[PDB]
Design a protein around this motif. Structure first.
Motif, mmCIF file in Angstrom:
data_model
loop_
_atom_site.group_PDB
_atom_site.id
_atom_site.type_symbol
_atom_site.label_atom_id
_atom_site.label_comp_id
_atom_site.label_asym_id
_atom_site.label_seq_id
_atom_site.Cartn_x
_atom_site.Cartn_y
_atom_site.Cartn_z
ATOM 1 N N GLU B 47 -3.286 9.936 -3.513
ATOM 2 C CA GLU B 47 -2.781 9.888 -4.881
ATOM 3 C C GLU B 47 -1.279 9.637 -4.910
ATOM 4 O O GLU B 47 -0.789 8.879 -5.755
ATOM 5 C CB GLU B 47 -3.127 11.185 -5.613
ATOM 6 C CG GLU B 47 -3.467 10.996 -7.085
ATOM 7 C CD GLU B 47 -4.717 10.161 -7.298
ATOM 8 O OE1 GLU B 47 -5.661 10.277 -6.486
ATOM 9 O OE2 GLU B 47 -4.756 9.389 -8.279
ATOM 10 N N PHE B 48 -0.531 10.257 -3.992
ATOM 11 C CA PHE B 48 0.903 9.992 -3.911
ATOM 12 C C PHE B 48 1.189 8.560 -3.474
ATOM 13 O O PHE B 48 2.145 7.945 -3.966
ATOM 14 C CB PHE B 48 1.574 10.985 -2.962
ATOM 15 C CG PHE B 48 1.927 12.296 -3.607
ATOM 16 C CD1 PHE B 48 2.655 12.327 -4.786
ATOM 17 C CD2 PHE B 48 1.536 13.496 -3.034
ATOM 18 C CE1 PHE B 48 2.983 13.530 -5.385
ATOM 19 C CE2 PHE B 48 1.861 14.703 -3.627
ATOM 20 C CZ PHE B 48 2.586 14.720 -4.803
ATOM 21 N N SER B 49 0.379 8.015 -2.561
ATOM 22 C CA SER B 49 0.537 6.618 -2.164
ATOM 23 C C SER B 49 0.239 5.674 -3.324
ATOM 24 O O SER B 49 0.906 4.644 -3.483
ATOM 25 C CB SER B 49 -0.366 6.306 -0.971
ATOM 26 O OG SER B 49 -0.094 7.173 0.115
ATOM 27 N N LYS B 50 -0.768 6.002 -4.138
ATOM 28 C CA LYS B 50 -1.082 5.177 -5.303
ATOM 29 C C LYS B 50 0.009 5.275 -6.364
ATOM 30 O O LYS B 50 0.306 4.289 -7.051
ATOM 31 C CB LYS B 50 -2.436 5.583 -5.886
ATOM 32 C CG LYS B 50 -3.601 4.740 -5.394
ATOM 33 C CD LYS B 50 -4.884 5.092 -6.128
ATOM 34 C CE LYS B 50 -6.059 4.279 -5.608
ATOM 35 N NZ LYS B 50 -7.324 4.616 -6.317
ATOM 36 N N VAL B 51 0.601 6.461 -6.526
ATOM 37 C CA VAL B 51 1.690 6.638 -7.485
ATOM 38 C C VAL B 51 2.928 5.865 -7.038
ATOM 39 O O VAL B 51 3.612 5.232 -7.854
ATOM 40 C CB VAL B 51 1.980 8.140 -7.681
ATOM 41 C CG1 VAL B 51 3.357 8.376 -8.292
ATOM 42 C CG2 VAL B 51 0.909 8.772 -8.559
#
Lengths: 55, 53
Positions: B47-51
């Motif tokens: 999720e942090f990589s997608k953000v």
């Protein structure tokens, strides 16, 4: 048929917590050593992205 | 006849895991907890990589 396929979902979901272990308790302990190690590592693998975000 | 064959195979697999003993049941619970925490960290990382993208 519908109720059997419905009750398959919790049974298969609980079975999914079994297929990752080979039927050998000695090798299970041997690789649970690195399972604990990788848990401790990914508790630290999220640290450096947060550090680069904060810095 | 395919359906209860699949459930019979699943129950046979569960029984074969239950043959090993209560120590392997504790191993099952421990690896389930470890993999649940592992997926909790993995989903947060994804999720942090997608953000960040």
């Amino acid at each position: 048929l519908a109720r059997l396929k419905q009750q398959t979902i919790p049974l298969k979901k609980k079975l999914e917590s079994y297929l990752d272990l080979m039927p050998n308790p000695s090798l299970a302990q041997v690789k649970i050593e690195e399972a604990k190690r990788e848990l401790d590592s990914i508790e630290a693998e999220l640290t450096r992205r947060v550090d680069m975000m904060e810095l | 006849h395919l359906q209860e064959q699949d459930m019979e195979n699943s129950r046979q697999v569960l029984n074969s895991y239950e043959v090993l003993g209560e120590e392997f049941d504790r191993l099952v619970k421990e690896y389930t907890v470890l993999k649940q925490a592992t997926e909790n960290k993995r989903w947060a990382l994804q999720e942090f990589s997608k953000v960040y993208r």
